[PDB]
Point group: D2
Chain length 262, copies 4
């Protein structure tokens, strides 16, 4: 396998049983990592993910957790440390979204997205970093952001806001913990073939519409993001902290200005 330094590393992944979280889990499995798959409620799906990691050449457990509950996130990290003996890479990937005209957006609906996407990642990051600090481990944190930490997103102001906050949260943590060798980075995916986009990509007109907004011309395969994660988690990225590495087929470069329009 590609990243030899990733062998036997303990990697926790929130939302690790579907879409991007699962591609990441599998890829860390391919690197002979020990993967801790957090899941919200679909245990049968998490078990399939667990199997895939093992099949790929890694070790895997599954831990139920709601990233909006502090006790759950504390449990999630404690379990990784107890079961595998340490923690090396923390991946806050869990996130949700839904379209609502902004002036019509309820506080409850706003809160759900902030709590899940932003505060969820803070809690994970804090628990991981607490462990690295207490134990002198030059650990790693990867937060799953989006092109929407840069690209504003009407009807998804809660989402955009959550990712914007994630950006400064990551950059702050990276700066604060850099002198201890703790690296903190975001990945910013573009439009990806995952369950979050399942209904949208079912409609051939909407799918064609999303594609027209991707300069590279195709919706991303989840393994393309998993590749980014493996790089960032690895010692290949030893001098890289505080960044957002966009994997977006050109989305953040303003797709409407193609061909010299404007």
């Amino acid at each position: 396998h590609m990243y030899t330094d990733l062998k036997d590393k303990v990697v926790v992944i929130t939302g690790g049983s579907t879409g991007l979280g699962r591609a990441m889990a599998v890829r860390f499995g391919q690197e002979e990592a020990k993967v801790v798959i957090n899941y919200y409620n679909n245990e049968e799906e998490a078990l399939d993910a667990k199997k895939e990691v093992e099949e790929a050449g890694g070790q895997a457990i599954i831990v139920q957790g709601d990233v909006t509950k502090e006790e759950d996130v504390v449990n999630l990290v404690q379990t990784a440390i107890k079961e595998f003996g340490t923690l090396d890479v923390m991946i806050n990937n869990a996130g949700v979204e839904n379209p609502v005209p902004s002036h019509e957006l309820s506080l409850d609906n706003w809160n759900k997205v902030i709590d899940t996407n932003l505060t969820g990642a803070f809690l994970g990051s804090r628990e991981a970093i607490k462990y690295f600090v207490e134990n002198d481990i030059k650990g790693n944190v990867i937060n799953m952001s989006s092109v929407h930490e840069m690209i504003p997103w009407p009807l998804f102001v809660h989402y955009a806001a959550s990712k914007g906050g994630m950006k400064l949260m990551t950059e702050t943590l990276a700066l604060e913990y850099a002198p201890k060798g703790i690296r903190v980075n975001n990945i910013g995916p573009g439009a990806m073939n995952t369950p979050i986009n399942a209904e949208k990509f079912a409609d051939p007109v909407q799918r064609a519409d999303v594609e027209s907004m991707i300069p590279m011309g195709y919706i991303g395969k989840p393994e393309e993001v998993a590749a980014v994660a493996a790089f960032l988690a690895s010692s290949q990225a030893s001098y890289v902290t505080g960044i957002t590495l966009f994997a977006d087929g050109g989305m953040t470069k303003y797709p409407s200005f193609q061909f010299g329009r404007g």
Copy 2:
């Protein structure tokens, strides 16, 4: 009396709501919109005689003003603020979401309670404020204006203040999104990003002459900002002089976002 010319004639009689409007930057803004003959609604949290002191100044500067108690983390208080303004003055023209808090905690030691108070105040309160105003603007075909009080820390990361940094980074994307969502209605939404300003949020810090000097050493222009320098920016952004300006963050920071340590060709 109209015994002096004012800079932005289009601001005269405009209804301007300002959260945290009784102190620091909020008060400086309140006073400035008064100077332009605006109808200022000063929101405050607890100190009523402070709020009344500010209402006095808005009037003495040439504006109209009411004070309204409200906690921006409380949804009904935000709805009430916007409702009070429309009831008392007949409309709403400019929403200024300025209330905010901060405190230093090593991030690995930051409690959810503490994180949440900062996120709820700084970011969520600004969303609520913005939502209420834009709701009103939309239902009445008013080309209204929102100003959110961000910081240099929507760009500058801030160790020991990870919650504050996150709240301001969220406000950026919130503001930018609203700006884009509502641009076709001519509703403009913008951030201001102050650097170190001489206000109560910094009073403890600035009382210590070594820290005061340290903060100044991080300001390329070499002095801590006067609150009226920020209000000058809000007055501009709120006015029709900024008609083509939406979705921006206007930093008023004496050069802080330009990386103070790289002066003199260091690095």
Copy 3:
């Protein structure tokens, strides 16, 4: 009487000052009763028309010929402003050019023309003004005319994009370097504006509507809306504002294709 009382009798130099945004700024500074030095490349009568507009608006004005790609022309321009009006207060580097070319087919000469005018021109202007400000303890002001394309990449206009991207870091550097002296240096980033740079494009009704479809606010900007930004930046109202790019773009930098929850 006018908006920014502190702009009265300030000496303001404007490259490309005879057309488009340049002319709109010249007239606006005239309304603020400033002394405007209109630099122009080679249309003397248009520059004379612009001078007449400044004066009527309530300012003073001179016209000075100069090619911003020539160091001696830029030196002469600043020197002329000082000799004629006595000093220099605001340097506006606004001259710029563009043309579409597939990047893999773009000639070096063409690359160079756009780079030298748009970026190196603004450097020369900025350097000359700052040199004067520094030698004479003046708290002067520099405004460089950038574009949304210091942030929005622009296929077929790679030379232009590169020029504005460079101008961004140039301005930010100078602002940092000279802030301790009270010299403010800022960019303006306009979106699509109604000027001669876009005349041929906007005479074509399909292209015109296509550009308008990329402006969230729904209209091509009027030059006066950019001049309003310049007046604000030059004035003491912006006393604490340096090193920024103030986009005036009707929302263009916000990604127009992401409206309506697309993506």
Copy 4:
């Protein structure tokens, strides 16, 4: 022979052109691509012996190398480089524009000649290289790759180095434009943004122990980067591991762009 493992199998036999390939970051990239069993075209300015040494290192690490003299400010020399890569190896896969120069001058003192040398070398040179590679890629339907060596100074302003900073900010928008322009053909274009690195560009500066420590104090990770740390990013960006990655600047800077002065909760 393939007697040892390497990380990126898809880089095997890829043709990789590196300007300034004989020293510093260029040399580390040349070698790393050699470790990946690539075919490396080492462009060099005037020190032939040093280039031949670099050639030897690449071969010893497991690659093929040739050396091509060329001044990146000369159109014909850049054209020659690409044509020589294509003639000698049969194709071109990865174009790396890495040559760059700098020198400290107070900005109001900086000569046109000195400004032009830096702009022509750093920005224009990178344009010509990117143009020639992309021309070839387009004519032959190759899904090629361009890596331009930028700097933290495409984001961090740099007094005394205004020419260098402009050149890198210009590179940012050039790279992002090209990436947008040629993404539909599957040609990927990216920048690397290194922080302070241990190379000949910083040699005089780092031999001064007080400047050395001063620079270190501005790097949050606490150390001057090793050149192979940038090489690692280049290997990544060039591989199909980065298949969905284009138009980006990947900063490898030990945290420099995160504003080193705001550590410890200062400001």
